[PDB]
C-alpha cells in the first residue's frame, strides 16, 4: 500500500510544500473528461487550491495518446502532477517513458526525492502492481483494498523483484501465476473519488455545505452503474448531511437559504423538471420493468395512471404546475399502487438541494443534466481530432454548470437530458423491433448500420447511455441469461465503427448472493490481444478500455476474431 486513507493529509502537505510557490505554477491537474465523478473531484480540488492560493493547471484529457502527448509537451518545472479518474491500471512510467533516475533529485540516508511527483486517483480495482508498489514517482491514494486484499500480491511482487534451481523456478512460477490471476480481471470500481477527496478534506477540516453537495453528486454519479457501492456509501453522506445542516430547521424561506434535505427521491427521470407521465415513460427502471418498447407498454402505462386515479392530463402536466393535491399526496399514491405492478423499488430516499426561491433539485436530475452537457454541449485522423476537441470543450460547459450563477446552463442541460433520453429510448425501441441484437454463446452483438441520429452515438457517453438503457431492459428479462452486449456505430465521415464493450448488471433492487459479486468487464485484455495481432488500424485510446474505434472494412473480421477469442 502507498497512501492509506489515514495518511492522505501527509500527501496534501507534501504537495503543498512542493508547489505552493506563487511565482510559478508547478502543480497540474489531469482529469478524464466524460466522467462525472472525476469532474466533481476536480471541482473539489480546484476550490481547495483556490483557498490556499496555489496556482494550478487543469487539463481535461479524453484519450491516452493525448495524455502522453501532453506529458511530452509538459515542462520540467512542474514538480507535481495530479491524475483524476485514470492511470491506476496501466504502466504509467512505461506509458510516459519514465525512469526514476531522470526525475530523482537529492537522492541522499534511506530516502528518495524526485523532481516531479505524480499522484493518481482512480478507483478501478486492477491496481497496477508496478505502479502501486514498484515506484516512488507514481503515488496512489488507496481506499483500503490494496492494504487488505493484495497482501499475497504484494509478497509475490516483492519476491519477483528480489529474485529478478528447480524449486526456485517452481516458486517463481507459483508467484507469477498468483500475480497473473490477480490480473486478467475485469476493470471494476469499488469506491467514488468524490468520497475519497471528501474524506481527505475532512482530515484537513476544510469542509462545507458546497463540498458535501459535490460529494453527494459524485456518489450519485455511480448509482446507475454501481448501485451496491452507492448503498455502501449512502450512510456516510447521510450522516454528513445531518451533521452539517444547521439546527434552525423549518425556518422561513429566504432568497439566501441553501438547504440540503433527505427526502423521498423516487427513481424516475427528471421528475421535478418534467411531467410525471414522461418521468415514468423515460425512467429506465420502469421501462425495463414493463418493456415499453412494445405497443402493450404504453397501454399498460395508461393502465397504471388510471389505476392510481390520476388524470392523464394531470400526469402529463409539468411538475411545477400540477395541482397541490397530487403534489402533496404523491407518496401515499405511490404506496397504494406501486407493489401491484412490481415498481415498489421506485420509491427511494435521496438528497435534495434548495437554493432560496429557485426551487428544489435532486442529485439524479443534476447528474443527468451534467452528463447531457458532457455529451451534446455543442481525412480520417483530422475530423476525429475535432470531435475530441468538442468533447473536451463540453467538459468545461459541464464544469461551469456547477456554478449557481449559471442556472441558465443547468436548464439547457436538463433539456439536453430530456432530448437524449428521448433519442436513446427511440433507438432502443427501434432496435428491439428490428431485433438488431444477435444472441450468441459469448456476447449479444448489436451493430447500428443506418438510421436516425446515428451521429449522436459517436460520443462515448452517448453510447454508454444507450448501453445502460439496453442492459437495464435486458436485465429484467429473466429468460435472457447474463451476457455482455457489444455496440458499434459507423461514423460516415471517418468510415469507422465505434465498438463499445459493455457488461451485464443485476436488476436494480435485485439483491442476491451473486449480486454482491460484481460483474467484471473482460473486454480490455480481449480487445488488446486481438488488436496486437492482425493489424486492423484499431484505435484504443479511451481510459475506459472497453471502447475502440475500428475500420469499417475490418469491423466484421475483428468481431469474428473476437468470437474466436475466449478471453472474455
Amino acid at each position: 500500500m502507498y497512501y492509506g486513507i489515514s495518511q492522505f493529509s501527509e500527501a496534501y502537505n507534501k504537495i503543498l510544500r512542493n508547489s505552493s510557490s506563487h511565482s510559478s505554477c508547478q502543480l497540474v491537474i489531469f482529469v478524464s473528461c466524460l466522467n462525472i465523478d472525476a469532474l466533481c473531484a476536480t471541482k473539489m480540488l480546484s476550490l481547495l487550491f483556490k483557498k490556499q492560493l496555489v496556482q494550478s493547471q487543469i487539463v481535461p484529457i479524453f484519450g491516452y495518446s493525448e495524455l502522453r502527448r501532453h506529458y511530452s509537451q509538459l515542462d520540467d518545472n512542474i514538480n507535481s502532477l495530479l491524475l483524476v479518474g485514470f492511470g491506476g491500471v496501466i504502466d504509467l512510467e512505461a506509458f510516459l517513458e519514465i525512469d526514476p533516475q531522470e526525475y530523482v533529485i537529492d537522492t541522499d540516508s534511506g530516502e528518495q526525492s524526485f523532481r516531479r511527483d505524480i499522484y493518481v486517483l482512480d478507483a478501478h480495482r486492477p491496481w497496477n502492481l508496478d505502479n502501486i508498489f514498484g515506484s516512488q514517482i507514481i503515488q496512489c491514494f488507496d481506499d483500503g483494498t490494496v492494504d487488505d486484499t493484495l497482501g499475497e500480491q504484494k509478497e509475490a511482487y516483492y519476491k519477483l523483484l528480489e529474485l529478478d534451481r528447480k524449486q526456485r523456478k517452481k516458486q517463481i512460477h507459483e508467484y507469477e501465476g498468483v500475480l497473473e490471476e490477480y490480473y486478467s480481471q475485469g476493470t471494476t470500481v469499488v469506491n467514488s473519488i468524490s468520497a475519497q477527496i471528501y474524506s481527505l478534506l475532512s482530515a484537513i477540516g476544510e469542509t462545507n455545505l458546497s463540498n458535501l453537495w459535490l460529494n453527494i453528486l459524485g456518489t450519485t454519479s455511480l448509482d446507475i452503474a454501481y448501485a451496491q457501492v452507492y448503498n455502501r456509501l449512502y450512510p456516510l453522506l447521510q450522516d454528513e448531511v445531518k451533521r452539517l445542516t444547521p439546527s434552525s430547521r423549518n425556518s422561513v424561506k429566504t432568497p439566501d437559504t441553501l438547504t440540503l434535505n433527505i427526502q423521498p427521491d423516487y427513481y424516475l427521470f427528471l421528475l421535478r423538471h418534467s411531467s410525471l407521465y414522461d418521468s415514468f415513460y423515460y425512467s429506465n427502471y420502469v421501462n425495463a420493468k414493463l418493456s415499453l418498447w412494445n405497443e402493450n407498454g404504453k397501454k399498460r402505462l395508461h393502465k397504471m395512471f388510471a389505476r392510481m386515479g390520476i388524470p392523464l392530463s394531470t400526469a402529463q402536466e409539468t411538475w411545477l404546475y400540477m395541482d397541490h393535491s397530487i403534489k402533496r399526496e404523491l407518496g401515499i399514491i405511490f404506496d397504494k399502487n406501486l407493489d401491484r405492478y412490481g415498481l415498489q423499488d421506485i420509491i427511494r430516499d435521496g438528497f435534495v438541494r434548495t437554493l432560496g426561491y429557485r426551487g428544489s433539485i435532486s442529485a439524479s436530475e443534476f447528474v443527468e443534466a451534467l452528463t447531457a452537457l458532457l455529451e451534446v454541449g455543442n481525412n480520417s485522423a483530422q475530423k476525429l481530432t475535432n470531435l475530441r476537441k468538442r468533447w473536451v470543450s463540453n467538459f468545461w460547459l459541464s464544469w461551469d454548470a456547477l456554478d449557481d450563477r449559471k442556472v441558465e446552463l443547468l436548464n439547457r442541460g436538463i433539456q439536453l437530458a430530456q432530448d437524449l433520453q428521448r433519442a436513446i429510448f427511440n433507438t432502443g425501441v427501434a432496435i428491439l423491433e428490428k431485433k438488431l441484437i444477435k444472441h450468441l454463446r459469448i456476447y449479444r452483438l448489436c451493430v447500428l448500420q443506418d438510421g436516425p441520429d446515428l451521429d449522436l452515438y459517436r460520443n462515448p457517453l452517448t453510447l454508454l447511455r444507450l448501453g445502460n438503457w439496453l442492459i437495464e431492459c435486458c436485465a429484467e428479462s429473466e429468460d435472457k441469461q447474463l451476457l455482455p452486449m457489444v455496440l458499434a456505430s459507423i461514423d460516415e465521415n471517418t468510415d469507422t465503427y465505434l465498438v463499445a464493450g459493455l457488461t451485464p448488471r443485476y436488476p436494480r433492487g435485485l439483491d442476491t448472493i451473486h449480486t454482491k459479486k460484481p460483474i467484471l468487464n473482460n473486454f480490455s485484455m480481449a480487445f488488446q490481444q486481438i488488436t496486437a495481432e492482425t493489424d486492423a488500424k484499431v484505435r484504443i485510446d479511451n481510459f475506459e478500455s472497453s471502447i475502440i474505434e475500428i475500420r469499417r472494412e475490418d469491423l466484421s473480421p475483428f468481431l469474428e476474431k473476437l468470437t474466436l477469442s475466449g478471453l472474455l
Binding site: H302, K303, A306, R307, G309, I310, P311
Partner: protein
C-alpha cells in the same frame, strides 16, 4: 312503468342485476365483454360505457324492455352502477370523472 322503476327496492334490484350483467355477460368466445370494457373505460378515461342493447335484451330482457320504455331513471341508475364497477376495476375513479 316509470313509477314502478321509482320504487326503491326495484331500484336496488335493478342495480344489482345490472352489476351482475356487466361483470358476467359472456359471448360465444367466453370472455366477459363488459369487464374489459370497464378496463378500457378506466384506461382511456372515456367516462362513457357503450352498452349494446342486444346484449341487455338477450340476457335479462325485461331490463331492456324497461329501457326501451322508461330510460329516464335507469340511465341514472345504470350510470351509477357503471361508476361503481369502474371503482371496482379502478379504485377512486371518481377523481378523474
Amino acid at each position: 312503468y316509470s313509477e314502478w322503476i321509482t320504487q326503491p327496492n326495484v331500484s336496488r334490484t335493478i342495480a344489482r342485476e345490472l352489476k351482475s350483467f356487466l361483470l358476467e355477460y359472456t359471448d360465444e368466445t367466453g370472455r366477459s365483454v363488459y369487464g374489459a370494457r370497464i378496463r378500457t373505460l378506466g384506461e382511456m378515461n372515456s367516462e362513457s360505457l357503450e352498452v349494446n342493447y342486444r346484449h341487455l335484451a338477450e340476457s335479462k330482457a325485461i331490463l331492456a324492455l324497461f329501457l326501451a320504455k322508461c330510460p329516464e331513471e335507469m340511465l341514472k341508475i345504470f350510470d351509477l352502477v357503471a361508476m361503481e364497477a369502474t371503482e371496482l376495476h379502478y379504485p377512486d375513479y371518481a377523481r378523474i370523472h
